[PDB]
Amino acid sequence: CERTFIAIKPDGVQRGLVGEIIKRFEQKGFRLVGLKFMQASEDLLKEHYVDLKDRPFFAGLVKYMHSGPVVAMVWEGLNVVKTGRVMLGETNPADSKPGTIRGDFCIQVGRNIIHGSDSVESAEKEIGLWFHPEELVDYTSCAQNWIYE
Amino acid sequence: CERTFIAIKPDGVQRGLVGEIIKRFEQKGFRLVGLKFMQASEDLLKEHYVDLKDRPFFAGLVKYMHSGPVVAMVWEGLNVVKTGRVMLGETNPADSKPGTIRGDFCIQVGRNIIHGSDSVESAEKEIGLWFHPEELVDYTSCAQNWIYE
Amino acid sequence: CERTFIAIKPDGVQRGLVGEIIKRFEQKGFRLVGLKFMQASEDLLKEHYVDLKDRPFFAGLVKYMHSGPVVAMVWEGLNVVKTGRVMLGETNPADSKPGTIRGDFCIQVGRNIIHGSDSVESAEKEIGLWFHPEELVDYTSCAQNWIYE
Amino acid sequence: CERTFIAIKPDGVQRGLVGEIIKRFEQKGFRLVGLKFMQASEDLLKEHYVDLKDRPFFAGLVKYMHSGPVVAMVWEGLNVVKTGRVMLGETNPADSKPGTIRGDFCIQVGRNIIHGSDSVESAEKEIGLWFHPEELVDYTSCAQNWIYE
Amino acid sequence: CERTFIAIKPDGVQRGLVGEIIKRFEQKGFRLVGLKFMQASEDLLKEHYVDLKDRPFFAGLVKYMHSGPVVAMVWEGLNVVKTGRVMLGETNPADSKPGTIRGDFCIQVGRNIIHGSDSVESAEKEIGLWFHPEELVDYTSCAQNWIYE
Amino acid sequence: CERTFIAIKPDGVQRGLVGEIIKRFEQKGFRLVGLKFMQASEDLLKEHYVDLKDRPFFAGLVKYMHSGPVVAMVWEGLNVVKTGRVMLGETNPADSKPGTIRGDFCIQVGRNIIHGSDSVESAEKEIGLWFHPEELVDYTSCAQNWIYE
């Protein structure tokens, strides 16, 4: 099945939202395939935020995402990339609706708690950038036949 | 007051979402008038899904809804049919928004956890098809005057 | 597996605790085998409270448990009778510890929200008294092998 | 930072939603600056609902908001006035989306549980009308740098 | 009915536990009669902690409880003083059991999140010390007859 | 500060309890220092369960803990080893009290959802056995001074 990359940013860890966030994906029916607590290197972050390499805020972005530990995750399921984004809510917490992670839990786009892959192709980039393939665990949910036909 | 029929499907029971679902209707202010745990017969299911009698997936639908027990419910209140549907979310979990039952809890339209009456008229059909009239309990909530003017 | 009878009393329904209570038994791993929303008849209640037939408060007890609808349940699992009682907490909410249903949710022994069978033998009495055998649904949880060895 | 006035109405207190509502604003990241449990006087209420002084329902509105205690609050943060309104949901619970306070918790516009300032200017009116300036507490959240850049 | 004084300490407010704590008392069935957000004066604190006036840590205690705003509450109900203490848990979070406020939410006795009156007589002292009598609101819960016989 | 090793077992992952468990440790005030999703090797498991090397069930234990992925964690705080065990509850879910992880979420000792180090010395063994020292992240909580004096 399809897979997406979700990172809980420094502010999401600091504010004690790690279990809250993981619970949303579990209760939805998505399968945890990768989980990892790290301090992302500025190099790794530079590669991650490469489409913004020439934007001005880039320097600060990489500085901040390096300022503390992140929880890197890989989740799997039908349309997990788009649905994951719906579950996170709008990138700017101000346009995020109640019920979503950014809608419920944060305020400002610079401290917006979480990242999710925006496309299947960027998902595959980011999973590959953040995880070794032997760090991705494959198993079958006991609930699979009740989640999918 | 108005009444709607809500059924928790086999996957909703299997995944342990019965208490979760009932809680959403209680905390909203709607009144439980009927509650019943059953295995719906293929006959009963055929009558329930009669507008899809000639559609192709019909056979599988009836087979699946018979594959395990369902929780049949009747809820009552102002606009409960439309609001109930809003609370369930879009029939395809993929269009369901976070905050709704299908939005929070499931992924695929074939395993979409729950059913709610789509109209007042289909509500009355379904309540009559699934419940004997002496199975419907009438009482007054202690909170009624704080729920309604 | 072992089975117990749990009834949510009129005050538990009035106070909107039905979904909350069911959720505690689901998340524990117990299997719902019977669920039923009714107004218990004074006759049925008299048989239920027969060990207190000659106690004085008996009249009031039967009057109260008839004063509104109850949710009658049958739950199944290893030691469900004793564990169900531990989950409910002490019969007097005043001795009930936080974390339990009566501990979390109620105050006075006369309005103590819930009933659970006190023994395997009284469980079998009460299941037989409150449920027709065809109202008890048998199925296998998708999670069974992860709940039991 | 910006500030808004939020009042939990008599029905919100009666239905035990005070901690629920406060939790939504805390977990969002907004800062509690004022909190106060009162019975609003008909005079105070008349000033509060002054734009509806000549509307017909006015009499009933003031009578109801006086019928029981309200929890008056002041919350602070980036765009708290508009975001607060988004968090409350539509004034008519019928147009309120799941995930929001009125969407999750109530049904009818006459018993709609909560009030929030509709503009920065009405916010400043209402804060001044409901709170003495020494009742507003200023402090710095330990989480501030993780909520704002 | 009996009344107790409960104060959420500076660390409880800082850590965003105000709504959480109030919710435990509401869902239990106790009645909020007083609610107030303040910075306790060192004088007021000295009177509050008068039995520890000659203990050494006293100076620090008063300094800390003055270091930030507290939520002062009065709650009412059958045995609310002792039950309130049971709900808070042991004063040292290390002896607090899961399910209780201190058991769930904190670690160290010096940052133990909350205060509750230890006796009916100290309750009456503290309510009188912290609240003006016109700040205490009297009303009847819609749920009273379902909480008490 | 003191550190303990906590592993969510295959049944805890299968049953969707990962976010629930992590939330209990976060909300308590403990600091996540290590997080890791893996399939434990039979060799690693043999070293982990070495005090039971000569017990008979050993073979099955290692087979089961290898049967699916586990979430390995390191948590840090005052008395985290003993408190962690209190939070998990009794090793046999049957003696576990409501409010605890095993008390709330599981039934049978063979499927008891979670592991926590039983001593400071076994904690140090297990952290060293399961984590590389560069996988343990050090940072300061924004809430530290509100958790500890």
Short mmCIF file of C-alpha atoms in Angstrom, two decimals, chain E residues 10-11 14-15 64 67 93 96-99 102-111, chain F residues 24 26-30 77-78 83 86-87 98-100 143-149:
data_model
loop_
_atom_site.label_atom_id
_atom_site.label_comp_id
_atom_site.label_asym_id
_atom_site.label_seq_id
_atom_site.Cartn_x
_atom_site.Cartn_y
_atom_site.Cartn_z
CA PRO E 10 1.19 27.91 38.81
CA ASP E 11 2.63 24.73 37.21
CA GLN E 14 1.61 26.72 32.81
CA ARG E 15 1.21 23.12 31.70
CA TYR E 64 6.57 29.80 44.25
CA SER E 67 5.40 33.09 40.92
CA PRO E 93 2.92 12.70 43.19
CA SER E 96 -0.27 9.15 43.68
CA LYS E 97 -2.01 6.36 41.79
CA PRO E 98 -2.78 6.43 38.07
CA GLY E 99 -6.28 7.73 37.50
CA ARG E 102 -1.38 14.14 40.47
CA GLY E 103 -0.95 10.49 39.48
CA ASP E 104 -1.68 11.22 35.83
CA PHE E 105 -0.13 14.65 35.43
CA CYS E 106 2.91 15.33 37.64
CA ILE E 107 6.07 14.01 39.20
CA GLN E 108 7.58 16.02 42.05
CA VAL E 109 6.06 17.20 45.35
CA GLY E 110 7.35 20.73 44.84
CA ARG E 111 5.57 20.93 41.46
CA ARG F 24 0.55 8.77 29.42
CA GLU F 26 4.18 12.80 28.18
CA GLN F 27 1.28 14.07 30.23
CA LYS F 28 2.96 12.81 33.41
CA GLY F 29 5.96 15.05 32.69
CA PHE F 30 8.59 12.49 31.71
CA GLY F 77 12.76 11.73 35.01
CA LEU F 78 12.71 11.64 38.80
CA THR F 83 6.84 5.35 38.63
CA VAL F 86 3.32 2.02 38.68
CA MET F 87 1.99 3.56 35.48
CA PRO F 98 -7.94 0.73 36.51
CA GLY F 99 -6.07 3.89 35.61
CA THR F 100 -2.92 1.99 34.64
CA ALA F 143 8.18 22.91 31.10
CA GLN F 144 11.11 21.71 33.22
CA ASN F 145 10.98 24.40 35.89
CA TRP F 146 7.27 23.71 36.25
CA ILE F 147 7.88 19.98 36.61
CA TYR F 148 10.84 20.24 39.00
CA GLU F 149 11.95 22.77 41.64
#
